[PDB]
């Protein structure tokens, strides 16, 4: 059943400037999208900003500007950040968009027509900073900005307050048994596994009904009115989660601006999302609430949710206020955009809370990118080794030759599964295992010596090296988008052979293909001094 592969990032609160967390989540989304495009699949990758609610409204009050002016400004900082990061996201959604608003009301009415929204009360704790309803078991003692005793979230450490409001309630309690059926019937639908187990454990215990509206004064009237009740606004989260549905229904022009909202999702063949990339902090919203609303509406459920961890720099939390910053653009200007991406995608898996340091960033840049991949690309394109500047015709293969070829033949299927879990770290590791293999082969065969000694043997060793580098580079292309293009140019791989499942096969580029021209003293990844 073929559709548009639909991958999303979270839409981010616009309370503050964009930082590593957001960049990371969108990078993960971008990579997944990029890979499926490399397979030759239709892709639609979505990211954006969550612009309503109390949090944002009150962040705009601190900075003493209107919410419309505040939100638009910070939204532009996000857009700029993502443009500077050189992503390939298809559309940037904002929850202030008028067409999104329409979809939110449409879904609301569905939930209501279905009998799953009633007038009740919520009386309990709330984290404004997480826009999250909490039970007493999930709060604890803490201190506020003033140094006074207050309550805080066990989840996030932010201040919680007690809310007692007549609210429209969604019947989440009625969806326990169907959510359980769902998790069980689709045991890869939440990644990694231990987070899937977390979600089941939680739903097993039982579900309370969820408040899906608030009194309008409380939100400083910065929200979407509940249909047929102007005294209420729609919960920022029901609003925010609906971005995914909205995005699936927006026809987008070449410039990347929304031009049309279709009545039915089947029209654009995107919904439901094949992968929702999220951080662990927002798992309940995506794994419990979201499916429940979809089941109520009679919409289809997403195929996979992947939830990753939080970053630290130098084993300490990132914060400008604490005296430890991590500026992606800054570190990307210092070491290179692809390199930085590689590091963030390699240093940590989705199970882990990764850690950045200049030390380890250099270790990987020098070690993996320069010595393993860079050195290899330069060797097989060297005028010293590749005397004719072309892909030679291989002679007969030795068993050692074939051992390496097998590794290259098998790499795509292995990488493919990893990109599909998704588990990008393990995909990258897969590829680099093969690059290390090729280097060992090259060191063994000493092709520099073969140029004088055995030219026929050189043709074979050199051909395998080039094809090894080609395949690995193709599979790395979603990770190193700019650098893969430089690599392919050096190898002289024709454009047509740079994507398509076809070109995962060993031997796609024919012998007699000419290398691209050599630039005066160029280097693919320059080694950086050890500090
Ligand atoms: C529908 S995803 C919403 C995520 C939320 N805006 C956040 O930053 O955590």
TrEMBL record:
Enzyme Commission number: 6.1.1.10
Annotated keywords: Aminoacyl-tRNA synthetase, ATP-binding, Ligase, Nucleotide-binding, Protein biosynthesis
GO cellular component: ciliary plasm; cytoplasm; mitochondrion
Keyword Aminoacyl-tRNA synthetase applies: yes
Domain Methionyl/Leucyl tRNA synthetase: 6-380
Keyword Aminoacyl-tRNA synthetase in annotation: yes
Protein's GO biological process: methionyl-tRNA aminoacylation
Record-annotated Methionyl-tRNA synthetase anticodon-binding domain positions: 392-531
GO molecular function terms attached to this record: ATP binding; methionine-tRNA ligase activity
UniProt family annotation: Belongs to the class-I aminoacyl-tRNA synthetase family.
Listed name of the protein: methionine--tRNA ligase
């Amino acid at each position: 059943v073929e559709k548009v592969f639909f991958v999303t990032s979270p839409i981010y609160y616009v309370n503050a400037a964009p930082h590593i967390g957001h960049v990371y989540s969108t990078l993960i989304t971008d990579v997944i999208g990029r890979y499926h495009r490399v397979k030759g699949e239709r892709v639609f990758a979505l990211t954006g900003t969550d612009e309503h609610g109390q949090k944002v409204a009150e962040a705009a009050k601190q900075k003493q500007v209107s919410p419309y002016d505040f939100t638009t400004a910070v939204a532009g900082e996000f857009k700029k950040c993502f443009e500077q990061m050189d992503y390939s996201i298809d559309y940037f959604i904002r929850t202030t968009n008028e067409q999104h608003k329409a979809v939110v009301k449409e879904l609301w009415t569905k939930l209501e027509q279905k009998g799953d929204i009633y007038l009740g009360r919520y009386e309990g704790w709330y984290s404004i900073s997480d826009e999250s309803f909490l039970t007493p078991q999930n709060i604890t003692d803490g201190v506020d900005k003033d140094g006074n005793p207050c309550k805080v979230s066990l989840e996030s450490g932010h201040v919680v307050t007690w809310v007692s409001e007549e609210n429209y309630m969604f019947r989440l309690s009625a969806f326990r048994e169907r959510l359980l059926e769902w998790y069980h019937a689709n045991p890869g639908c939440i990644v990694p596994e231990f987070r899937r187990r977390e979600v089941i454990r939680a739903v097993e215990k039982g579900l309370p009904d969820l408040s899906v509206s608030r009194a309008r004064a409380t939100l400083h009237n910065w929200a979407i009115p509940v249909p047929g009740n102007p005294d209420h606004c729609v919960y920022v989260w029901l609003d925010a989660l609906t971005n995914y549905l909205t995005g699936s229904r927006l026809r987008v022009d070449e410039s990347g601006k929304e031009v049309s909202l279709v009545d039915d999702f089947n029209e654009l063949e995107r919904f439901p999302a094949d992968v929702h990339v999220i951080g662990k902090d927002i798992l309940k919203f995506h794994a419990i609430y979201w499916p429940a609303f979809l089941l109520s509406a009679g919409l289809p459920l997403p195929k996979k949710i992947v939830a990753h961890g939080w970053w630290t720099k130098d084993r300490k939390k990132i914060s400008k206020s604490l005296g430890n910053v991590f500026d992606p653009v800054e570190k990307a200007e210092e070491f290179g955009y692809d390199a930085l991406k590689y590091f963030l995608l390699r240093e940590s898996g989705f199970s882990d809370d990764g850690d950045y340091s200049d030390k380890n960033m250099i270790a990987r840049l020098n070690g993996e990118l320069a010595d393993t991949l860079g050195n290899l690309v330069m060797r097989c394109t060297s005028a010293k080794i590749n005397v004719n500047g072309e892909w030679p015709s291989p002679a007969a293969y030795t068993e050692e030759d074939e051992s390496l070829i097998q590794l290259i033949k098998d790499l795509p299927g292995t990488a493919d599964h990893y990109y599909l879990i998704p588990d990008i770290q393990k995909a990258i590791i897969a590829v680099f295992d093969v690059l290390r293999a090729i280097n060992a082969y090259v060191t063994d065969m000493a092709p520099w010596k073969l140029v004088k000694t055995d030219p026929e043997r050189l043709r074979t060793v050199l051909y395998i090296t080039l094809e090894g580098v080609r395949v690995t580079t193709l599979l790395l292309s979603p990770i190193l988008p700019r650098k893969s293009v430089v690599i392919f140019d050096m190898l002289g791989v024709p454009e047509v052979h740079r994507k398509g499942i076809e070109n995962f096969e060993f031997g796609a580029v024919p012998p007699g293909t000419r290398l691209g021209p050599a630039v005066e003293g160029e280097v693919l990844f320059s080694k950086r001094s050890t500090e």
